[PDB]
Structures are given as C-alpha cells and as structure tokens.
Amino acid sequence: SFINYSSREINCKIVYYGPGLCGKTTNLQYIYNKTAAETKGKLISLSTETDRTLFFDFLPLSLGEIRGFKTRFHLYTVPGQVFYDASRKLILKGVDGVVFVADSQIERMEANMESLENLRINLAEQGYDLNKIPYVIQYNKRDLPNAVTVEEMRKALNHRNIPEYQAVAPTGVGVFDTLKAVAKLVLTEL
Ligand SMILES: Nc1nc2c(ncn2[C@@H]2O[C@H](COP(=O)(O)OP(=O)(O)OP(O)(O)=S)[C@@H](O)[C@H]2O)c(=O)[nH]1
Numbered sequence: 109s110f111i112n113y114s115s116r117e118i119n120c121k122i123v124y125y126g127p128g129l130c131g132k133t134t135n136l137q138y139i140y141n142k143t144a145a146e147t148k149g150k151l152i153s154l155s156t157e158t159d160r161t162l163f164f165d166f167l168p169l170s171l172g173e174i175r176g177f178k179t180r181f182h183l184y185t186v187p188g189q190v191f192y193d194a195s196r197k198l199i200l201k202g203v204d205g206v207v208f209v210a211d212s213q214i215e216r217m218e219a220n221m222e223s224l225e226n227l228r229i230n231l232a233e234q235g236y237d238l239n240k241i242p243y244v245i246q247y248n249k250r251d252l253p254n255a256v257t258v259e260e261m262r263k264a265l266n267h268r269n270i271p272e273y274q275a276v277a278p279t280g281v282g283v284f285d286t287l288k289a290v291a292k293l294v295l296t297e298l
C-alpha cells in the first residue's frame with residue numbers, strides 16, 4: 109500500500125489477472141464509463157493494433173474518503189496472453205489486491221487453470237502468497253449458451269472459497285460488485 113499522513117491520502121493497487129480474452133480490460137472500460145468524471149482519472153490502455161492488452165491497462169479512482177483520508181484505488185489489468193508473461197509479472201510490483209477474471213467458456217477452462225497457476229507462480233516469485241493476498245475471483249461471460257456452470261467452475265478454480273462474482277463484463281453486471289468486494293478486502297485494519 110502507500111499511506112500519506114502529511115497529505116492525508118491512501119493509495120492501493122489492484123490487479124486484474126486472467127487468461128487471454130477473459131475480460132479484464134472490459135471490466136476496466138465499463139468501470140471507467142460509468143464513473144463520474146470528477147472521481148476518476150484517465151483510462152490508460154497500453155494495447156496493440158488488435159485491441160489486446162500489450163503491457164497493462166491503468167485506471168485511477170479518487171474514490172470517496174475513509175476516516176478522513178483521501179483514498180485512491182489504482183486499477184491495473186495485465187496482458188494476460190501467454191507470450192507476454194515477461195511483462196505480466198511486472199504488474200504485480202506493489203500489488204495489494206487481486207481480481208481473477210475467469211472466462212466461463214468451456215473451451216477456456218484449461219487456460220483459466222493455467223492462468224491462475226501462472227498467477228500463483230508470479231506472486232510467489234514477487235514474494236507474495238496467493239492465499240495470503242486479498243483476492244477475489246470473477247466468472248466472466250455468464251451470458252453464453254454453454255457457459256460452464258458456476259458450481260463446476262468453482263470446483264476447478266475456487267477450492268478455498270474466496271468471494272466469487274458472476275459477471276457479464278460488457279454489460280457491467282457483476283463488475284462494480286467485484287470491485288467493491290476487492291476494495292473492502294484490501295482495506296486492511298490488521
Ligand atoms: N460473451 C462474452 N464476451 C465477453 C464478455 N466480456 C468480454 N467479452 C469479449 O471478449 C473479448 C476479450 O475482451 P478483453 O477485454 O480484451 O479481455 P482481456 O482480458 O482484456 O484480454 P487480454 O488483455 O488478456 S488480451 C472482447 O471482445 C469482449 O467483447 C462477456 O462477459 N461475455
């Protein structure tokens with residue numbers, strides 16, 4: 109994290125982790141679209157010609173005030189696709205909370221597994237334990253006809269019972285509720 113007693117502001121880093129085309133940038137775009145122009149910064153998206161995230165998406169939220177503190181939440185999304193691992197692992201610099209965006213398509217349940225595993229590897233290499241970090245999981249793409257059932261998707265991705273939220277990113281369903289969950293967890297009085 110980062111406290112600023114003299115400035116009276118709190119800064120936290122949240123990272124959306126997930127395989128390719130699983131909806132991280134979509135989460136952030138929807139968030140930016142429905143946030144008052146007063147409490148949000150510009151949405152930066154280091155993307156390629158194809159619209160896939162090339163380094164990261166970054167979105168600040170000058171959100172409300174804690175016990176008088178300013179509170180600023182820094183949303184990040186990684187490149188996700190496999191061959192950008194080099195860059196992906198960099199986004200977890202001073203990560204304070206994680207959101208795992210799982211693609212609920214059946215074809216990409218394997219890639220979901222691989223991406224969660226890459227997540228654990230990269231956090232450990234960064235000096236973080238996935239079970240120790242505040243982290244939430246999202247089951248994106250709940251609008252598809254053959255989207256894997258929520259239960260059978262938890263069995264494969266959520267053995268430890270961390271908060272799960274079903275979402276349809278483009279529409280925004282589940283998006284802000286996911287962000288709220290991650291934020292409430294990140295706010296550590298411990
Ligand atoms: N069917 C369905 N498609 C979705 C949903 N959310 C996002 N998509 C689509 O999937 C594609 C991937 O979205 P995108 O936002 O680029 O994912 P990403 O995680 O940022 O992809 P990357 O950065 O790892 S490469 C987009 O074309 C988007 O429209 C959803 O909830 N349901």
Ligand SMILES: [Mg+2]
Nearest residue numbers: 132133160161
């Ligand atoms: Mg993206």
